[PDB]
C-alpha cells in the first residue's frame, strides 16, 4: 500500500543522492520509504545509527564486505549481480560529535534494463526502513560498450596455463558510455580506472575543446601493460602497487572532460568483489584515442586487457590547428645570494653546503612577450614551456604576469567555512577520514572522500577552482587559479605543495613594481612573484606544473588565449636530517631523527636541523634565531614545564653560534616547518656542554639543542682522504666492470681514508655490476645511496640528480635485491651508439652508522664511483620506429599513423643490430630477439640460442622516455637463417626483417659522422 509507507524522496545535491536516517528530522524511525530516482553516475550514500539489525545483515570485518540486496525475484543476491557491474559497495562507520552509526555507499552503473535494489531495515521482527533504489534504463544497446572479463567469450575464470589473456577491443564514438568489469580476485588495473588509464595513443582535434587544453603529456609517456612489467622485477614484492609503480599512470580522461566515476586510491577488496569501472565520452568528440585497463590477479599472474581505441581512424579529418606556435622559456639558475653573498658570488666566481641551494627564476612576468599575441597575425596563439630540474635544499621563485593591485576575491574562504559543526569521522577497514557537510540541506558525499584520496582537495574545493577560473574577468589567468605555489598540479592533480613536498618553506623576495626593495609576503596573482624553499629530505622524485597565461580578450576564449607551463622536477636527495617532529607523536612523513616531551638534538657541523611546530603557537616567535641560553644543571631533566622557560635568557643565535643560518618565516598562515643550517665549525670558547640553546612549543613540549663533548671530540679525527686508483675491477673478455666497495663503506674495521673515488672509463656494450649493501645488515643501519633512484637517476655535476636518459639515451639499468645475503646488484649496460662523452658519479655512504665496540667508536666512509662513457661513433644498422632514436639507428621514421612498414637489413659477423619500438606497442612475438620469428622455417617461433649459440642479446622494455630497445650482436656463427619482429598497434603495423649471412655484410660507408662539442 502506498498510503501505508512514509514516502520521502532522496536528498539530491551535487549529483549525490543522500538518504540520511541519522540526523535528519524528515527521515526518522518514529513511524520509512527512502526512494532514490537514481540517474547515471549518482552516488547512493545511506546513513544510519548503530543498531535492531539490517535484513542484509552486514557485520563489521575486514573480510566481510559482501553487500547484499534484493532483486526482482525476492532473492537475497549480491549487488554486483543485481546491478550489472556495480562499483563502490562499501560499509563504513561514522561518528558525528560523539553519536555513532554506520553507512552504506555505492554508485550507479549504466544498465540497458530496469532494475531495483531493496535495502530493508529491520528491528529486534518488524520492518523499519525500505531504501528502494529505482534505477531505470539509461543507455541503449548501441550506446553502451563493454568487455566483461567474468563471462562470455572473454572469461579469464576458466583460463588455462597456456593462454592467459582474453584481449577485447570495442570502439567508442561520441556520446558513448563504456566500462570494464573484472571477476573475483582480479583487481582493476591501474587503481581507479578510467581516471587512471594505460594510454597508448591520443590524437587531438582542435574543434573538440571548449576550454584550453590543460594536459601534461610528460615525456610523451604513454603507459605500459602488466604483461611487459613483471618480467623485470624482484621476486617476493609483486603486489598490485609495485606493478602500478612500474607501469606508469596517466589521467588524460579527467582533462578530456570524460565523466570518470570511480573510487580513487581507496578501492574495494578485490579478493571478494567484482571491481568495475566506467567513463562517459563528451558529446563533441571528434578525436582519436587509445588506452587500456586490466583485470589482474597478482597471485596466478592472469590478466585481461581491454584495449579501447575509438571509432574514428581517419587522420585527414582531424583538424590539426595551425594557430598554435610553441615557444621555449628555459629557467634561469643563479648562485645563492643573501643580500651580501650576491657580491661574494660575483667576486669569487670571476676569479674561479652553501653551494647546494642554487636559486631558480622562471620569469614569465618579464618574458610576457612569449605569452603575448603577436601583431603579425591576430589568430595565432602562443604556448610556452619551462622545464625546471632541482635537487633538495634548493630555492625556486616563480614569476608570472599580473594586474597591478589585483584583489583575489574571498569567495573561496566564503565557500570554505570550515567549522566544527560539520565534523563527521568516517572509518572503513580501520582507516579514518574526516569529512564535512554542505550547509544547505544537510548533504555530504563519499565522492568527496574519494576525491580527497585522489585529488587531495574536497568536492566543493574542486567546483570552486573550476568556477574561479571559468568566471575569470581579468586579463591574466592562472592554473591553478587560487593560492598559487600553495597549490600545484603534479601528474595532472591539483594538490597542496607542502603536503606533497613535505617541509617546504615559502621564502621572501623583492616585489617587482615597488621601489621599497623590501622582501615581503609574495603571492603569484597578487605581486607577480612567489618563492619557495625545497625541504632537505625528499622521499621520491616528483614533478609539478603551473600555468600563467595572458589573453588579449578578457575571457578564456582559447582562440587568443596564450599559456605558460612551468614544469618543476624535484629530485630525491636522501641524507639524514636531524630535528624534532611534533606530528608523529600525536600517512604522515617525518624527516627528523626524533631523539626522544624534552627533545635533545645534538649540534653537528655541516647539517640542517628542523622543528615541525606551528608558526605562532610556540613561545619564541623567532625561536631558531632566538635562544634560551641556559645551563643543563639549571633545568631539571625530569620534573619541568614550559613556564620556567619564561624566566630564561633570550640571546640571539647570531651571537653565540658563528654564522648559523636560521630559516623561519612564521608570519604566513600555513607555515608548519622551521629550519636551521648549523655552520662548518664549532668552538668551545663560546659553548659549554651544559649550556644549551633551548626552545619550547605550544607551552607543553620542549627542545634542547645541546652539544655533547664526545660528539665534538669525534669530529677531530680526520686527516687523510685520498683517491683510489682504478680498483673497480674489469673483466675485459666479458667486458664487465665488477665493483666491490662493500668493505670500504663497512664501519666494522678501522679505515684510513674517509672518502675515496673510483674512476671507470667504459665503452658501448660494456656491463657495470656494483655490489652495495642495504639497511638490514650489521654495521649498515644508516646506509644511503646517492642518488636514491639508481635505476633512473645519476649525479650530473657531482651533486645534481638527473635522469640518465637525457645524457645516455637507452641505458640498461637493473637493480637486483639479493635477499639471501641482503645485498643489491647494480647492472648497467651502455647502448651500442653513444652520441656524446658523458660523465657522472654514484655515491655510497655509511657515515651515520655507528660501531661502538670495546668502548671504541668507529664510523663509516664515503665511496663514490666516477663513470665516464666515451664517444660511441659506431652506428646501429637497425630499423627504428620511434623517430627520436635517429641518432642510434639509420632508418628513422616518426611513428605516423597507417604506417604498415617493412624494413630489411642483412647482418653478418661482429656487427651490431637491433630495433627500437614504442613501449606501448603490441610486441610480436613476446620478448623479441630472444625467441625470434624465423623466416627460413616459414615465420615461426625459434629461440636465438637454439639457432645460434654464440650470440649476445639485450632488451629493455621501458626507460624513462618510454621506449623499448633491443640489441643483438653475432660473434663467430656460420649458419644461414632469417628472422623478423612485428610491432603491431591498433593503427599501424611495423616489421623488421634481419637476414643472417656470414660472408655477406652491408656495404659500409667505412667511417662515421664525428659529433664533437667545443666551447
Amino acid at each position: 500500500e502506498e498510503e501505508d509507507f512514509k514516502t520521502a524522496q532522496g536528498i539530491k545535491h551535487n549529483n549525490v543522492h543522500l538518504c540520511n536516517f541519522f540526523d535528519n528530522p524528515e527521515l526518522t524511525f518514529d513511524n520509512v520509504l527512502c526512494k532514490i530516482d537514481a540517474e547515471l553516475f549518482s552516488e547512493v550514500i545511506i546513513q544510519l545509527p548503530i543498531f535492531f539489525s539490517l535484513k542484509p545483515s552486514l557485520v563489521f570485518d575486514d573480510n566481510n564486505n559482501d553487500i547484499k540486496v534484493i532483486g526482482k525475484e525476492k532473492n537475497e543476491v549480491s549487488i554486483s549481480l543485481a546491478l550489472k557491474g556495480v562499483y563502490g559497495n562499501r560499509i563504513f562507520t561514522f561518528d558525528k560529535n560523539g553519536k555513532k552509526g554506520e553507512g552504506i555507499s555505492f554508485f550507479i552503473p549504466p544498465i540497458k534494463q530496469d532494475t531495483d535494489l531493496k535495502f530493508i531495515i529491520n528491528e529486534t521482527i518488524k520492518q523499519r526502513g525500505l531504501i528502494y533504489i529505482f534505477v531505470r534504463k539509461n543507455v541503449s544497446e548501441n550506446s553502451f560498450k563493454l568487455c566483461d572479463f567474468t563471462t562470455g567469450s572473454t572469461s579469464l575464470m576458466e583460463l588455462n596455463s597456456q593462454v592467459k589473456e582474453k584481449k577485447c577491443t570495442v570502439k567508442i564514438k561520441k556520446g558513448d558510455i563504456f566500462g570494464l568489469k573484472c571477476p573475483k580476485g582480479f583487481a582493476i588495473f591501474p587503481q581507479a580506472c578510467f581516471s587512471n588509464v594505460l594510454l597508448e595513443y591520443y590524437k587531438s582535434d582542435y574543434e573538440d575543446s571548449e576550454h584550453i587544453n590543460y594536459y601534461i603529456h610528460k615525456d610523451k609517456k604513454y603507459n605500459l601493460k602488466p604483461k611487459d612489467v613483471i618480467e623485470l622485477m624482484d621476486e617476493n614484492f609483486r603486489e598490485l602497487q609495485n606493478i602500478q609503480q612500474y607501469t606508469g599512470i596517466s589521467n588524460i580522461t579527467d582533462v578530456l572532460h570524460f565523466k570518470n566515476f570511480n573510487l580513487g586510491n581507496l578501492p574495494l577488496n578485490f579478493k571478494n568483489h567484482y571491481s568495475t569501472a566506467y567513463a562517459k565520452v563528451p558529446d563533441t568528440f571528434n578525436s582519436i584515442i587509445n588506452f587500456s585497463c586490466n583485470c589482474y590477479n597478482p597471485e596466478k599472474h592472469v590478466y585481461g586487457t581491454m584495449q579501447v581505441e575509438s571509432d574514428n581512424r581517419n587522420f585527414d579529418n582531424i583538424k590539426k590547428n595551425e594557430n598554435v606556435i610553441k615557444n621555449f622559456l628555459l629557467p634561469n639558475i643563479e648562485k645563492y645570494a643573501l643580500l651580501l653573498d650576491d657580491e661574494e658570488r660575483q667576486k669569487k666566481i670571476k676569479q674561479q653546503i652553501l653551494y647546494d641551494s642554487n636559486e631558480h627564476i622562471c620569469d614569465y612576468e618579464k618574458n610576457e612577450s612569449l605569452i603575448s599575441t603577436l601583431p603579425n597575425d591576430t589568430k595565432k596563439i602562443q604556448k610556452s614551456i619551462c622545464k625546471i630540474n632541482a635537487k633538495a635544499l634548493d630555492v625556486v621563485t616563480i614569476k608570472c604576469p599580473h594586474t597591478k593591485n589585483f584583489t583575489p576575491k574571498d569567495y573561496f574562504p566564503n565557500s570554505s567555512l570550515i567549522t566544527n559543526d560539520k565534523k563527521i569521522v568516517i572509518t572503513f577497514d580501520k582507516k579514518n577520514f574526516v569529512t564535512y557537510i554542505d550547509p544547505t540541506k544537510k548533504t555530504f558525499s563519499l565522492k568527496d572522500i574519494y576525491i580527497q584520496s585522489f585529488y587531495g582537495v574536497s568536492l566543493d574545493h574542486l567546483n570552486q577552482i573550476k568556477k574561479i577560473h571559468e568566471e575569470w574577468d581579468d586579463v591574466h589567468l592562472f592554473y591553478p587559479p587560487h593560492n598559487v605555489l600553495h597549490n600545484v598540479v603534479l601528474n595532472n592533480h591539483i594538490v597542496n605543495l607542502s603536503s606533497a613536498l613535505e617541509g617546504v618553506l615559502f621564502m621572501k623576495s623583492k616585489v617587482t613594481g615597488d621601489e621599497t626593495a623590501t622582501k615581503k609576503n609574495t603571492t603569484l596573482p597578487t605581486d607577480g612573484v612567489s618563492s619557495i624553499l625545497i625541504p632537505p629530505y625528499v622521499k621520491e622524485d616528483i614533478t609539478f606544473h603551473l600555468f600563467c597565461g595572458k589573453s588579449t580578450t578578457k575571457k578564456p576564449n582559447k582562440k587568443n588565449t596564450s599559456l605558460a607551463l612551468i614544469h618543476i622536477h624535484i629530485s630525491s636527495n636522501r641524507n639524514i636530517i636531524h630535528g624534532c617532529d611534533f606530528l608523529y607523536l600525536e600517512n604522515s612523513y617525518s624527516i627528523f631523527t626524533h631523539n626522544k616531551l624534552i627533545c635533545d638534538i645534538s649540534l653537528i657541523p655541516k647539517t640542517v636541523i628542523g622543528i615541525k611546530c606551528p608558526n605562532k603557537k610556540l613561545n619564541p616567535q623567532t625561536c631558531f634565531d632566538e635562544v634560551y641560553y641556559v645551563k643543563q644543571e639549571d633545568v631539571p631533566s625530569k620534573t619541568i614545564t614550559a613556564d620556567k622557560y619564561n624566566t630564561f635568557s633570550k640571546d640571539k643565535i647570531g651571537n653565540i653560534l658563528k654564522n648559523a643560518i636560521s630559516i623561519n618565516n612564521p608570519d604566513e598562515k600555513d607555515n608548519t616547518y622551521t629550519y636551521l643550517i648549523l655552520p662548518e665549525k664549532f668552538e668551545e670558547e663560546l659553548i659549554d656542554t651544559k649550556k644549551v640553546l633551548a626552545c619550547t612549543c605550544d607551552n607543553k613540549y620542549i627542545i634542547h639543542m645541546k652539544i655533547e663533548k664526545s660528539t665534538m671530540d669525534k669530529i677531530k679525527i680526520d686527516e687523510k682522504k685520498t683517491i683510489g686508483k682504478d680498483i673497480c675491477k674489469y673483466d675485459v673478455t666479458t667486458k664487465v666492470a665488477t665493483c666491490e666497495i662493500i668493505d670500504t663503506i663497512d664501519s666494522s674495521v678501522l679505515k684510513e681514508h674517509h672518502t675515496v673515488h673510483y674512476s671507470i672509463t667504459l665503452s658501448r656494450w660494456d656491463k657495470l655490476i656494483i655490489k652495495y649493501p642495504t639497511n638490514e645488515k650489521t654495521h649498515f643501519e644508516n646506509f644511503f645511496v646517492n642518488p636514491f633512484n639508481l635505476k633512473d637517476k645519476v649525479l650530473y655535476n657531482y651533486n645534481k640528480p638527473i635522469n640518465i636518459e637525457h645524457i645516455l639515451p637507452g641505458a640498461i639499468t637493473t637493480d637486483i635485491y639479493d635477499t639471501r645475503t641482503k645485498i643489491k646488484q647494480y647492472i648497467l649496460r651502455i647502448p651500442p651508439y653513444v652520441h656524446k662523452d658523458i660523465h657522472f658519479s654514484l655515491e655510497f655512504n655509511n657515515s651515520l652508522s655507528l660501531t661502538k665496540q670495546n668502548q671504541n667508536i668507529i664510523y663509516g666512509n664515503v665511496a663514490k664511483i666516477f663513470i665516464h662513457i666515451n664517444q660511441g661513433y659506431k652506428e646501429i644498422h637497425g630499423c627504428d620506429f620511434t623517430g627520436k632514436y635517429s641518432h642510434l639507428f639509420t632508418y628513422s621514421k616518426k611513428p605516423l599513423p597507417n604506417d604498415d612498414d617493412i624494413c630489411n637489413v642483412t647482418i653478418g659477423n661482429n656487427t651490431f643490430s637491433g630495433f627500437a619500438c614504442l613501449s606501448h606497442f603490441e610486441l610480436k612475438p613476446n620478448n623479441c630477439f630472444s625467441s625470434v620469428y624465423d623466416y627460413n622455417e616459414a615465420n615461426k617461433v625459434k629461440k636465438l640460442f637454439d639457432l645460434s649459440t654464440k650470440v649476445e642479446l639485450d632488451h629493455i622494455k621501458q626507460n624513462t622516455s618510454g621506449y623499448t630497445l633491443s640489441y643483438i650482436i653475432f660473434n663467430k656463427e656460420s649458419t644461414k637463417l632469417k628472422f623478423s619482429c612485428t610491432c603491431s598497434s591498433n593503427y599501424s603495423n611495423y616489421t623488421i626483417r634481419i637476414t643472417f649471412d656470414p660472408n655477406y655484410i652491408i656495404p659500409e660507408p667505412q667511417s662515421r659522422a664525428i659529433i664533437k662539442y667545443v666551447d
Binding site: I325, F328, L329, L330, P331, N332, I333, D363, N367, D726, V732, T733, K735, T761, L762, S763, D766, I802, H806, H835, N870, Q871, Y873, K874, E875, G878, C879, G883, K884, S886, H887, F889, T890, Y891, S892, K894, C903, N904, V905, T906, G908, N909, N910, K972, N999, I1001, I1002, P1003, E1004, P1005, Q1006, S1007, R1008, A1009, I1010, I1011, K1012, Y1013, V1014, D1015
Partner: protein
C-alpha cells in the same frame, strides 16, 4: 642475367653519414640550460657512391635555422676567410646526385651522393646558425657541417662494355682490348674494377674459378656500373674471381706481404709472417713484458696485427686501451680502417689496415704480463 640497378638489394638505411641537426633530434641547436656547447660534424672519407643526409627544420613555423648558404647542397661554402656561395659544380665533383627532399612535413632532407672521381681533396661547409634566438639571455648553438671528400689512393680500373661513353677517367680496356674472349685482371691491393655492363648474372662476382673466393664485402651494383672492392689482405696467389659471353677473370697480384706485429705464436704452421716473433711462454710469468710498435709514415697504407695465443683483451682492434678502453677510430680520427677476423686452431691472429694520414698522435695498447703497445705519430 639481370640489370645491376636492383642487384645491390633493397636494404634501406645505407646512408651512414648523417649530420642530424633538428629539434626532435638529440643534436639540437636550441638554446638550453643543460647544454651550452656548439656541435661539430667532421667527415674524412673515400666516398664511393654513398649519401649524406642533413635533417634540418625549415624556415616555416618561425625562422628557426639560419642555413648558410640557403641552398646548401646547390651552393656550398669555401674556407671561412673567403666565404662566398660557390656553386656545387665548381669544386671538381664528378657525377653527383643532389636531392632536396622537402616533401616530408617536418624537415628539409638535403642529400648528396658523391662518386670518388676527383683529382684532389674536396672540402666544403654548410653552417646552421641559431644565435638569433635569445631565450632567458641564453643564445642558440651553431653547427659547421664540414665534409672533406678524399681521393681514392689506389689505382682504379674502368673498362668499356656499354654503348654510351663517359670519359671521366682514362680508359684502360674495351671490347677491342678483350683479348681471346677472356679478361685477365691483375689488381694490386684493394682496388675497384668498373665493368660498364647492363646484364650480369644474379650470383656472379661471388665465387671463384680456380679455388675459394677472392672477394670482400663492398661489392657495389650501380644502376649503370658494376664495382667490387678488392680485399686488402689475402692468403696466397691461388684464388681468383670471375663473372660473366664476355668472360672477365680477376686475380690478385699477391706479393710477399709484410705486417707489423709482436706475434708470440706457438704454432709454426702460421700463414701470416709478421716482423717480430718473440715468444710469450718462453719467459717466466712474472716479468712485465712490453711490446712497442712505433709507426711513422707520411702516407699510411699499413697493416698491423698480432699472433699471440690465449685470450686477447680487449676486443682488438675494435676497442683498444687508453695510453680505460676507447675506440680506434676515435683516437686515429681517420675512417676507412679495415679489420680481418681469423679463427685458427691455437694461436689468435688479429689484424687491421689503415690507409690515409692521421692528424694527431695516438698510442693504443692491446694486452695478451704480455703487453703490446702500438704508437702512431702525428708527424
Amino acid at each position: 642475367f639481370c640489370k645491376p640497378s636492383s642487384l645491390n638489394s633493397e636494404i634501406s638505411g645505407f646512408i651512414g653519414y648523417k649530420c642530424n641537426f633538428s629539434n626532435e633530434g638529440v643534436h639540437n641547436l636550441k638554446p638550453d640550460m643543460r647544454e651550452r656547447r656548439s656541435i661539430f660534424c667532421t667527415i674524412h672519407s673515400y666516398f664511393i657512391y654513398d649519401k649524406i643526409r642533413l635533417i634540418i627544420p625549415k624556415k616555416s613555423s618561425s625562422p628557426e635555422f639560419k642555413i648558410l648558404p640557403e641552398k646548401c647542397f646547390q651552393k656550398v661554402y669555401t674556407d671561412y676567410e673567403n666565404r662566398v656561395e660557390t656553386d656545387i659544380s665548381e669544386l671538381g665533383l664528378i657525377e653527383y646526385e643532389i636531392e632536396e627532399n622537402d616533401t616530408n612535413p617536418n624537415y628539409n632532407e638535403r642529400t648528396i651522393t658523391i662518386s670518388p672521381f676527383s683529382p684532389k681533396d674536396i672540402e666544403f661547409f654548410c653552417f646552421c646558425d641559431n644565435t638569433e634566438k635569445v631565450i632567458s639571455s641564453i643564445e642558440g648553438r651553431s653547427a659547421m657541417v664540414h665534409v672533406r671528400v678524399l681521393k681514392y689512393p689506389h689505382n682504379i680500373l674502368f673498362t668499356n662494355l656499354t654503348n654510351d661513353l663517359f670519359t671521366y677517367l682514362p680508359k684502360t680496356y674495351n671490347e677491342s682490348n678483350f683479348v681471346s674472349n677472356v679478361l685477365e685482371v691483375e689488381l694490386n691491393d684493394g682496388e675497384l674494377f668498373v665493368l660498364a655492363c647492363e646484364l650480369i648474372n644474379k650470383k656472379c662476382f661471388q665465387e671463384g674459378k680456380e679455388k675459394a673466393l677472392y672477394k670482400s664485402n663492398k661489392i657495389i651494383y650501380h644502376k649503370n656500373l658494376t664495382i667490387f672492392k678488392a680485399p686488402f689482405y689475402v692468403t696466397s696467389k691461388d684464388v681468383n674471381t670471375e663473372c660473366t659471353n664476355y668472360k672477365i677473370v680477376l686475380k690478385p697480384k699477391y706479393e710477399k706481404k709484410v705486417i707489423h706485429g709482436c706475434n708470440f705464436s706457438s704454432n709454426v704452421s702460421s700463414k701470416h709472417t709478421f716482423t717480430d716473433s718473440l715468444d710469450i711462454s718462453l719467459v717466466d710469468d712474472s716479468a712485465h713484458i712490453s711490446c712497442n710498435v712505433h709507426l711513422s709514415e707520411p702516407k699510411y697504407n699499413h697493416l698491423v696485427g698480432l699472433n699471440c695465443p690465449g685470450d686477447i683483451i680487449p676486443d682488438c682492434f675494435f676497442q683498444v686501451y687508453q695510453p680505460n678502453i676507447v675506440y680506434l677510430d676515435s683516437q686515429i680520427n681517420i675512417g676507412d680502417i679495415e679489420y680481418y677476423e681469423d679463427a685458427e686452431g691455437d694461436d689468435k691472429i688479429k689484424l687491421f689496415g689503415i690507409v690515409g694520414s692521421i692528424p694527431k698522435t695516438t698510442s693504443f695498447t692491446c694486452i695478451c704480463s704480455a703487453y703490446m703497445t702500438v704508437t702512431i705519430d702525428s708527424a
